[PDB]
């Protein structure tokens, strides 16, 4: 019965609004499919939900891995995907390991370790590439699109975010 209909909301004047209609199908809402990071992969089940007009949406509910891109060198590769670090809206969601765009995550450096040989390719991603995990944030809507692609964090977002989570 979830709905985004405005009828159930009060007015600007804080006034109750008469309910002129029963909930309608067009204004319907569906359960948030919380994409869940698998963590160790040793399953990606992605659902497909019928929409309005017989369209389709892919709902990620559990998945690991996914395409990532190093914007500074403009090289793009699939990555294993490690634990979510930071959620910017909740500290519980990070520990739960739910995936949603804007949630910063660690990634394995092994696919992108090929740039350690190269030199002066920034300095921050050089130290993450040397390290097991790379700081990266998600750029895809895991629940609506069904994929969780992301961009490796580079420059200022990485600077502010590192300070936000890593130091104790």
């Amino acid at each position: 019965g979830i709905t985004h209909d405005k009828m159930y909301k009060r007015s600007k004047t804080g006034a109750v609004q008469g309910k002129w209609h029963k909930k309608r199908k067009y204004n319907l809402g569906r359960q948030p499919a919380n994409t869940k990071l698998i963590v160790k992969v040793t399953g990606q089940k992605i659902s497909t939900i019928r929409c309005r007009g017989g369209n389709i949406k892919r709902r990620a509910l559990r998945l690991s891995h996914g395409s990532f891109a190093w914007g500074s060198a403009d090289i793009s590769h699939k990555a294993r995907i490690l634990q979510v670090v930071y959620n910017s809206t909740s500290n519980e969601l990070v520990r739960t390991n739910t995936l949603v765009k804007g949630c910063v995550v660690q990634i394995d450096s092994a696919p992108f370790k090929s740039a350690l040989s190269n030199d002066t390719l920034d300095k921050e991603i050089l130290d993450q590439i040397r390290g097991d995990h790379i700081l990266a944030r998600i750029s895809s809507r895991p629940g609506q699109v069904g994929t969780a692609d992301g961009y490796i964090l580079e420059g200022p977002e990485l600077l502010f975010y590192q300070k936000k989570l890593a130091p104790k």
């Binding site: 600007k12 500074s72 420059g155 977002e157």
Partner: protein, 152 residues
């Protein structure tokens, strides 16, 4: 840089990684001149404000009716109340009754706004519950020019 702000903000239209180097093909902000003869403000061109809801430097696009009204309230952050004075004609008695309609407008930091000033609003996809209008120009007045019910 702060310790109190929970989430980092940038422009989706700009690239944060780009800012690290190449001091040639470098742009500070993805601002575009608005149509309907709207000049992009200079404060907006040289402006370090993220403003996703900025008409000039943000995803917001101005399409629809464009109105002109006074500034009634500005207590909200990045939002002002535009009082729209107007006249209603009665036919049973041939006189006009004065009316007032308050409208909510998202204001960019490029606009510095004080009460009693007159703002030129424009239509926007609803930004919030009460905000379907964005400011495209702000005109100040000396001190408080009284009120005088002006249907601008």
């Amino acid at each position: 840089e702060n310790q109190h702000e929970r989430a980092y903000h940038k422009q989706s239209q700009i690239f944060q990684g780009r800012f690290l180097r190449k001091d040639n093909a470098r742009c500070l902000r993805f601002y575009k001149s608005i149509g309907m003869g709207y000049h992009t403000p200079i404060t907006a061109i040289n402006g370090t404000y993220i403003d996703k809801k900025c008409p000039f430097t943000g995803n917001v696009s101005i399409r629809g009716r464009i109105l002109r009204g006074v500034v009634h309230s500005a207590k909200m952050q990045r939002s002002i109340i535009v009082r729209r004075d107007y006249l209603h004609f009665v036919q049973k008695y041939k006189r006009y009754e004065r009316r007032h309609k308050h409208v909510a407008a998202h204001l960019s930091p490029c606009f510095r706004v004080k009460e009693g000033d007159i703002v030129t609003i424009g239509e926007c996809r609803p930004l919030s519950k009460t905000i379907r209008f964005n400011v495209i120009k702000v005109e100040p007045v000396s001190e408080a020019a009284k009120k005088r019910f002006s249907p601008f």
